Design a protein around this nucleic acid. Sequence first.
RNA 1: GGCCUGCU
RNA 2: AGUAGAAACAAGGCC
Lengths: 25, 718, 716, 248
Amino acid sequence: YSPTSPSYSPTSPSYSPTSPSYSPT
Amino acid sequence: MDVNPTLLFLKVPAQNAISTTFPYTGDPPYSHGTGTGYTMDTVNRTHQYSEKGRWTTNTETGAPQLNPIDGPLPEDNEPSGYAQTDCVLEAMAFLEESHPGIFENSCLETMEVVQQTRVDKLTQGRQTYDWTLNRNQPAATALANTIEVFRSNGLTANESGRLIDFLKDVMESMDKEEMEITTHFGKKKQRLNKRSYLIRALTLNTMTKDAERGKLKRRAIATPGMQIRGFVYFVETLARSICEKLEQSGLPVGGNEKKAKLANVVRKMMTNSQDTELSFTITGDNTKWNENQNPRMFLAMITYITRNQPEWFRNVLSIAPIMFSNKMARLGKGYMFESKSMKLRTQIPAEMLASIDLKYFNDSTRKKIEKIRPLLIDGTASLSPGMMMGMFNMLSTVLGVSILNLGQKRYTKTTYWWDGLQSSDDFALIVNAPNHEGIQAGVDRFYRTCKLLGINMSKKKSYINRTGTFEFTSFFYRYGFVANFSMELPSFGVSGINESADMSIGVTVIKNNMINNDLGPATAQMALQLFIKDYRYTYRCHRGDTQIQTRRSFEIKKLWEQTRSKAGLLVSDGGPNLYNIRNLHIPEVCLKWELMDEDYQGRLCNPLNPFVSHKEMEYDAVATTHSWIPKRNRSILNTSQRGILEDEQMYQKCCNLFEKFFPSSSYRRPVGISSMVEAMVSRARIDARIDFESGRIKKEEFAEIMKICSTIEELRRQ
Amino acid sequence: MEDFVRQCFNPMIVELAEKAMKEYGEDLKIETNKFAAICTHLEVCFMYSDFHFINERGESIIVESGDPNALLKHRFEIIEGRDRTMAWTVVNSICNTTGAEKPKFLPALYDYKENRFIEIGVTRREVHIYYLEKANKIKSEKTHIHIFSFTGEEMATKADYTLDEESRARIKTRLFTIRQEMASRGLWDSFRQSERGEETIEERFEITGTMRRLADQSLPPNFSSLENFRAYVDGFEPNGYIEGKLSQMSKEVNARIEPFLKTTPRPLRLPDGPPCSQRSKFLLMDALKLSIEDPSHEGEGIPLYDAIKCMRTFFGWKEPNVVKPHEKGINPNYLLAWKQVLAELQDIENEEKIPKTKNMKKTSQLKWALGENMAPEKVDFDDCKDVSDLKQYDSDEPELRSLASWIQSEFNKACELTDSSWIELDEIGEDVAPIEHIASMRRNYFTAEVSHCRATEYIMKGVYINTALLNASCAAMDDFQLIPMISKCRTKEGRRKTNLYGFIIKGRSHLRNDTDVVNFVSMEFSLTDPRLEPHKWEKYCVLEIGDMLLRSAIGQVSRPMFLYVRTNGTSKIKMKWGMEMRRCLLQSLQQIESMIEAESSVKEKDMTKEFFENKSETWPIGESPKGVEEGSIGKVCRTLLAKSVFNSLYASPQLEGFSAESRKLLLIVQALRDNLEPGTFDLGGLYEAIEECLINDPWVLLNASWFNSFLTHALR
Amino acid sequence: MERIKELRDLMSQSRTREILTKTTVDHMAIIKKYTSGRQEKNPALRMKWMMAMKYPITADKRIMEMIPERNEQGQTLWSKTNDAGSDRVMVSPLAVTWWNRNGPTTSAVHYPKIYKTYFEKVERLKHGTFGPVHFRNQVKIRRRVDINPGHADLSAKEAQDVIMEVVFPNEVGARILTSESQLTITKEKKEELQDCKISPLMVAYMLERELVRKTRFLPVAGGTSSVYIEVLHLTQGTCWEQMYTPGG
RNA sequence: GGCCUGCU
RNA sequence: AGUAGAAACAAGGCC
């Protein structure tokens, strides 16, 4: 089971403010 | 969207989701200092609910006292302590009439108990104020000091071993011309005149209450001395005997029996009513319960209960309210000061509040001191006209049950009638009538009668609604009791006794909550997983496979590597967790017995190991090396009471030797009044005699042991 | 008459008789005759026992005095005058070893050669009646009975007097002499007529002296003595006193029922003042994380090494400078503290091995920030008495503060579903019973719906921070440690990660009571500029340390990075209840389980699957401009978990008081909504009690706002 | 024999003699419980705060000679510092695990006998058979039940008397058994313990646990047999139910 | 500086 | 400064 919140907005925010990417990874 | 948890009650009835509104996950409020700011407030308020009472001056303690009983009837809804003796006796007499023979049987049972009880029973108590050090000492230490002083000062009737004999000693002490004690500071002899000792025997020690849920303002809780403990014990025994025979008294039983009684009452009232009759359940609550139960009413009740009983029993029961009516409430630690400019702080003992100037305090503490000063005597305040905290909950519940009974439609003489269940400080009353004005009249009658008996209903925490939904001491009821799980939440963590004890206690708590508070299977499994996680994180006993680095991980890993059947190690030694919803009632070590290695099994439960403490909520435990006991704080060493540790060492040595002589001393408390040496010598002589008669002991050993006993007796007699 | 008993007998006999009387509880002062009788019986039995020593075979030497031997072999073993416990112990021991039948009552002596007991008594009544009472008392008597009356009459069973007649004559002479002395005194008749009541014991507890003088002052006002009060109560009979006083009482004392209607309740009166500010021990919404993929679990690894490795991933460090001063502090001190922490991290990195814990140098910056030497010196009141500014410790009501908009946004963000897995629970015993399988399925659902919530991230952060602080303050009670914040999670693809929010620098932590304070300057990363909600960051000292280059849906954005430095404190009880923060999961999941089971009871089949997957029946949670917005069971679970987590984080007395006083009103409203016709005696008092708790706590203010919204939506 | 030698050595000193002579047998309980360390108000907090320290456990003096000063690595297992008010020395949990992995062995073959109730419980659970789970409303009525699976039909006082007679024949005191059933069970127990090497106290505690009958107030619905009430948490739920047949 | 205490 | 809320901590006792 994979949770899916209708308010997900998985594409709404351009980046997660708390857990960003910064690093080239 | 603004998430709003409280909006969930638009659909889920409040009772069902009531667990949401219990913030029992954060640290409870803790008193941050001295309880002398609340004790003075309690004294002032107790004297303010009874100010119209009749002042006087005790002629023995020499302190002012207030006597509100039979005072003017209250004229406003404000709290009133003016209990009427005639009304109290009417309530008790009607209670006896409705339940014939309750008081006679209760008195018989209590007479047996008081004739049978031993002095050792006073040890099974919490902190008590010992009058020989003016500090709080455990019950056993205070009792030992009191008995030592009594023996030193000529009182020795308590050596018989019965509690009533110790009470006789206590009473004979107050007549002693001048007591003396030998407290240390190399020790000094401090002599207390009659009045000083009497004031010290009646004094109550007050400390602030900690870890209180559901209140914004801290309270004050008091602990009684050691002279008043026995009389309170006997009175409480009588009150419990009476309450156990009352269907409407919920105090002397557990939670589930409270549920049963309350459900029975609701079924009896609501169902038996015809269609036309209405019903209304009052989920009320009494305000300032302690500050209005005048001990003189308890004396009236105790005298009415003990009618037609032997005079000695009547006196020994009545002595408790007589001592509580003259109690002095020791203030407390005393305030503390500071100097912002000079950058320093000072501590002033509460004793010098009577003499200290009022230029230091606030605008509120100054008023409190100004008002409490007249009552102070030698650093303690007279607190006659009320109680401090409980200590008579059973008898107060008897009074509440009497007032509830007083409306059985045989004493109401009217269409409306009421009954319910009473638990000290909390009641649920179920009114019936043929019309709404009938319910109004019934509620007014109940309120006025309670006011006469000296107990006030709180009008800011009581509502009346059609029968069905109601609440009672946090047992919500919606057409059948609903289990709120947030009250038992604090119990889930590791209790903190030791490893095996913690495992047993946690699994037992999970099982019990599954039984009572309707904890579901999946939630029980998640609680089990979280408890195991917390237990490992607290005892550093991780699974071993993990690369955790802790002070204990090295040899947990070593033991894991050594073992063959790794699925048998105790969770305390890094083994796997094998519990589930079906194994919660089986102690752990008994669970993994089949999976254990012979070597590990032998090492684990080895009686020779030096960790087991020979034993000490009922948690099912199995003796094991993981039953060690934690250390003590060792904070006494700095203080002047260093010598007490030597006393403990010597007492433990002597008691261990006695245990060696008498096998049953550990199991059942040893009775008898022969000195310890004489008992030991007599046992040795008889043992040698029987062994020589038929056994291993021969003539040489018999002669040696007999001569050793003879020289021991000679040393004793010196 | 005490002189007779004290003189005519030996000191040891009177001493042990005193011990016996004290044992039974009597007082020799009153029952002197009983004392004399006990002493006489003891002397009789002792004279019976003494001067008898058996030997190898069945015979005795019966010496007169002072003739001991190595072959003691006492012919008699006295049982009387040993105390009840010791007497019964010896009786049971001898009965067990011999195997005889234990006498029901305590005998006097024992015979070893013959292996039987002997009972001896002294009687003032007729001898035959006493002897037959003794015989019938001893059921199935295998024990010899002997009776010695003062007048000289003797009797026994079968007349088997197994004793030397010289001993009998000696005891007869002793009794005759005692009778002569008693007759000379004149108490002999009293002894003869007093034997009837000696066996029975009556308790003689009484009140006299000071106790009686206190009892005479502890009665209703109109009574003078305790005896008069007892006489009045005993003669009391009910005559309508209650019904007589009810009418006499004023009619203003009533319990008028005020009906509670849809219009009665009113919105709670939230306080007014400056907006409230953050008070949690770590940033919740504005918490950056410098992560590095690492195959480690939970506690594996050295926290310092993990922290430095995470720090060595972000390459945008700049020279720190203050961008939102503290308004009350020495902010340059905060800047130097951060500089020192960074230098110390470089130092530890340069070292060969990584110490488990690092103790910071005691510099002025940490000394001020951690409040060292701040406490006034303790002094006695004798000399610090005339000080001009000496007062009582400031104890005043907390400063009032109003509700801000940030707490609602934080609670919103603390309910969303993240894309990680913040909780990884160990295995459980293998399931066998079908209940275990159903529970496992439902638990998979729950732990999936709760492991991804951000409230669980806050739970884990709090647990780790409090555990680390407690362990460090219990060991290094005199050095400034450096405790980096760490948290580990599984990404959406299962890869493990470790995170680094910031650093903590514990101060001196000599905690004695479970309320003392250990100050720890908390340094935290963040990406949110403080110049947007300045009223919220009242107690921090934000600095600008670096400039990240994050990748978004647009690509590189290059936002600046900030460091929220602040001092703070936590006690030994807050640390414990923060370490125990995992019960929030239990609370929320128990509520959700209750709801699901309640629904599934009606429909005879499990309902969890469609509840969590079909997006079936939904609950009203939240409030949008369009009205109340429904939410699925997943969102209800997450919202309840977030509520519990915030209760744990923002705990305070105000919350407890408000929760209770508002549960009362909530139950009243629910009773109204069920058409139960509620009714209140004093609603205004309840409202005033509720409004007294809302003072300055952001969480309590937010809860009051929710309650006002619920009252608006309910009853309408 | 050594008992009297130790008594003589103890009374040789002044304070020990004074305590020995003044105190009577009745005051033994008070003297045993005489201690300055008060009970923990918050055991959980103290335990969580104590395991952080070194040597949070107290063990008998014999640890000094039974367990080395330090293990292989060199972590101290015990410290000569004495406890507050006893001769017990302070040790760390490393000591407990060191005992478990290296301590003297022993034959625990008698352990199942001493704790026979718990192993009988496991035996019942192991041989139990389950059935289908039914979702249906449960009328959880509250009544008093018996929680002891094998109660021997004896009151607490009567059970205590039986235990004292079985394990402490000499200390039985004035009490004499009356019911023939008591005598029969006493003989049955005495025959099977004619030679048992475990301490008398453990035997007494075991007999007390497996003879005294216990009753508790539970919300049971279906069952009430002591065997069924044992697993009440597994066959009774708010909405679900299960058929369970304990092994027997 | 040294000793002692982290509920006394 | 900071925690905290009707009173406290921000180390205490002794040589």
